Amino acid sequence: GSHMTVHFIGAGPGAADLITIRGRDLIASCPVCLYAGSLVPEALLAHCPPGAKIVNTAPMSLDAIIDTIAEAHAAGQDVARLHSGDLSIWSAMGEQLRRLRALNIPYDVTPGVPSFAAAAATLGAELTLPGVAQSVILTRTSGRASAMPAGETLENFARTGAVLAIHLSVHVLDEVVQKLVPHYGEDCPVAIVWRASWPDQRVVRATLATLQTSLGAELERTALILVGRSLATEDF
Amino acid sequence: MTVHFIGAGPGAADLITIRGRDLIASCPVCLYAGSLVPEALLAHCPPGAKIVNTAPMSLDAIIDTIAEAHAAGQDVARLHSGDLSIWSAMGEQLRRLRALNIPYDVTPGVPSFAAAAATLGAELTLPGVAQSVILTRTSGRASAMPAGETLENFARTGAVLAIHLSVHVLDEVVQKLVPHYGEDCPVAIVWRASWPDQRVVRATLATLQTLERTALILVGRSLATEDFDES
Ligand SMILES: Nc1ncnc2c1ncn2[C@@H]1O[C@H](CSCC[C@H](N)C(=O)O)[C@@H](O)[C@H]1O
Ligand SMILES: Nc1ncnc2c1ncn2[C@@H]1O[C@H](CSCC[C@H](N)C(=O)O)[C@@H](O)[C@H]1O
């Protein structure tokens, strides 16, 4: 047989049917499910086996989360640990792994559909365009929410001319365009996708100079900003 | 009818989305981009489905085959490796389908850099270390890169790099990055993530020793460090 394992699973961008097959099958097979708040679609939780311990981690500290996993480990019970999107980017999986290694609790990771992919799909767009863009930068702004390492400034990324997929930043929409106009041009295409794949999904396309900045301060913060020529060109 | 562009995922049959599998099961016609789309997914095609490998085909022939399905009112499952947003050549197909008024939609998939990070058990962004991931490639005698998109310019940011389509020029990648990232900078290469013959190498830029081409290069401190903050 196999021993108790914590299965980190990328739940995808919000639609229950955008989890992987593997992701859903692991949910179906774990007696304990820990899900990272309402950004994990509740319909996924219907896959938990009958009698599962289902735990919303959004009100919990990292310590409480780790203690709960340690309890599952002590009981020999597999855990389905669900995070929105994919695990590789801004998931806070890393800090959990470090704690699990220190406790010798085994884990594995099942990749998900990241939100920039959901957003591109919503737009019906290939981001890479021969002769226009051959790179995509996944980034964020400090946005009064983080320190960025020194070299990770919008200015330094903007200098490459790559497609930018800017996360965690819709509340600072106005600063973003101010910092990007000098590099990309006033007329550079920009697209914002709120809540990609949710019943709630909303899109705005414009150029940097013509984007309605006040859209950012609105209630919904789950939005991805895409910037670059390849968002609105057929010249490729 | 509708042409369903679908991100097949990194290769394992179970790393397609539920939606993607369901769309495949409901399409009388399936167009798949080569053996980089695992054959097990083709088992999901409905009985008597016309299944077509597009790898041997020109864009004109692909669009013809689609226009045929459209004239026959038959939905098309159009499979590409990984996700569609990056180096899929989905774009040129949509440009042609628009010019013909053929309806399409896009189902996102798991990109290979995500599958690679997952096999490594790694979160790429780590507070106080790296808050950005650059998905890129090299010219590598296979492309022209826009002028701003050099390894040099990217390396200047100190971001994590997920370098695609570049394993044939690993030597030159290493030499360009060392000056910026350091000789001791952790690096990992994942060949064929999620496939049965998946191979993983973890090293540093200096100690990585320079033939499958389906490989992803990942570079950065966050690949092997526990000195980071909570979020
Ligand atoms: N369904 C969705 N639609 C649009 N943007 C989304 C989204 N889900 C997450 N995001 C973006 O991701 C940020 C949260 S950080 C978590 C990102 C997630 N791990 C991923 O793989 O994408 C949000 O601020 C927003 O910029
Ligand atoms: N299973 C896999 N393992 C490692 N790298 C892979 C892979 N599948 C694709 N790649 C990478 O992607 C390149 C092909 S370009 C297609 C990328 C795909 N659309 C995606 O979403 O990732 C290859 O050169 C390789 O770098």
Side-chain angles (χ1 to χ4, degrees):
Chain A
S2 61
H3 53 242
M4 182 277 179
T5 300
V6 183
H7 302 286
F8 289 82
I9 302 158
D17 65 341
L18 294 179
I19 192 160
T20 61
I21 297 176
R22 193 187 294 178
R24 193 193 59 175
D25 292 354
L26 289 174
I27 293 166
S29 76
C30 292
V32 179
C33 179
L34 265 60
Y35 70 100
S38 59
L39 289 167
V40 172
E42 173 189 15
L44 286 180
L45 306 179
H47 301 297
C48 296
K53 177 184 180 166
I54 304 169
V55 181
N56 176 7
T57 59
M60 304 174 61
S61 61
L62 178 56
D63 279 350
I65 290 159
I66 301 304
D67 293 343
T68 304
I69 291 164
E71 183 175 331
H73 181 258
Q77 300 186 306
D78 272 21
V79 173
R81 209 305 188 224
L82 302 177
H83 285 286
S84 171
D86 179 53
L87 305 143
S88 63
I89 53 189
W90 308 291
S91 62
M93 168 179 78
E95 70 187 30
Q96 293 175 86
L97 270 26
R98 171 176 58 185
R99 297 286 295 271
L100 298 182
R101 286 191 302 273
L103 294 174
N104 195 14
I105 299 169
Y107 56 81
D108 58 37
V109 184
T110 295
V113 178
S115 67
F116 84 93
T122 296
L123 296 167
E126 184 186 2
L127 299 176
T128 47
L129 208 14
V132 173
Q134 282 300 305
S135 312
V136 177
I137 301 177
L138 310 173
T139 193
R140 60 177 300 182
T141 61
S142 64
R144 288 151 16 245
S146 64
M148 305 286 295
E152 294 181 30
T153 61
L154 281 184
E155 286 86 357
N156 280 351
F157 296 129
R159 250 167 273 181
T160 72
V163 174
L164 311 183
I166 307 167
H167 302 66
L168 296 153
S169 295
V170 81
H171 64 288
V172 291
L173 196 41
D174 182 67
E175 307 178 7
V176 175
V177 14
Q178 281 163 357
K179 299 176 175 185
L180 294 179
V181 171
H183 298 89
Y184 282 96
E186 276 179 19
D187 60 329
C188 175
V190 56
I192 305 178
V193 189
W194 285 267
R195 302 267 292 174
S197 90
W198 291 92
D200 216 359
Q201 180 181 278
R202 163 162 215 169
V203 172
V204 179
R205 305 176 192 254
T207 63
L208 295 172
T210 61
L211 178 71
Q212 185 192 336
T213 277
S214 73
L215 291 165
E218 90 182 30
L219 58 146
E220 190 56 61
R221 268 165 139 148
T222 298
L224 182 78
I225 304 158
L226 290 161
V227 182
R229 297 286 165 182
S230 64
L231 290 172
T233 185
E234 290 189 296
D235 293 331
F236 65 88
Chain B
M1 55 72 86
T2 304
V3 184
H4 302 294
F5 290 81
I6 299 159
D14 62 346
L15 294 176
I16 198 175
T17 59
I18 305 308
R19 189 185 297 174
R21 181 202 66 197
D22 291 350
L23 288 171
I24 293 172
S26 75
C27 280
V29 180
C30 182
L31 276 50
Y32 73 102
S35 61
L36 278 190
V37 171
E39 277 199 36
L41 293 174
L42 312 175
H44 290 133
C45 296
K50 183 190 187 173
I51 308 169
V52 175
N53 182 7
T54 65
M57 307 178 57
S58 67
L59 179 59
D60 281 341
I62 293 154
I63 299 305
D64 282 354
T65 308
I66 292 174
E68 187 167 317
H70 171 74
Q74 290 177 312
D75 285 333
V76 174
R78 209 308 186 217
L79 306 175
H80 286 284
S81 182
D83 182 54
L84 308 142
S85 66
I86 52 172
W87 308 288
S88 62
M90 170 171 76
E92 65 189 27
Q93 297 170 81
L94 307 180
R95 180 170 62 181
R96 294 281 296 266
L97 295 183
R98 286 196 294 278
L100 292 175
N101 304 305
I102 297 180
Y104 58 83
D105 58 30
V106 186
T107 299
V110 177
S112 70
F113 86 89
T119 315
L120 296 169
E123 183 189 1
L124 302 176
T125 54
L126 294 177
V129 173
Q131 284 295 293
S132 305
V133 180
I134 298 184
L135 313 178
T136 189
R137 62 175 301 181
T138 55
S139 283
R141 309 182 298 279
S143 64
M145 294 291 288
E149 294 178 27
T150 59
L151 284 186
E152 285 68 25
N153 281 2
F154 293 140
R156 273 196 39 236
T157 68
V160 172
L161 312 180
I163 305 165
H164 301 70
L165 292 147
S166 303
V167 82
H168 61 292
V169 289
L170 225 206
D171 192 26
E172 299 93 297
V173 176
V174 173
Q175 323 307 308
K176 284 185 177 185
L177 298 177
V178 168
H180 298 92
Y181 286 90
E183 283 75 0
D184 52 321
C185 189
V187 57
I189 305 167
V190 184
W191 287 264
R192 310 257 301 159
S194 87
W195 290 93
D197 60 351
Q198 175 186 285
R199 184 161 178 253
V200 169
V201 166
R202 294 171 180 274
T204 70
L205 285 173
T207 59
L208 181 75
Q209 259 136 56
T210 312
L211 196 136
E212 179 63 54
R213 278 142 160 257
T214 308
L216 184 85
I217 308 161
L218 290 155
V219 178
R221 297 291 163 180
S222 65
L223 286 176
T225 188
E226 296 177 308
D227 300 324
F228 62 90
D229 310 314
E230 299 183 14
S231 64

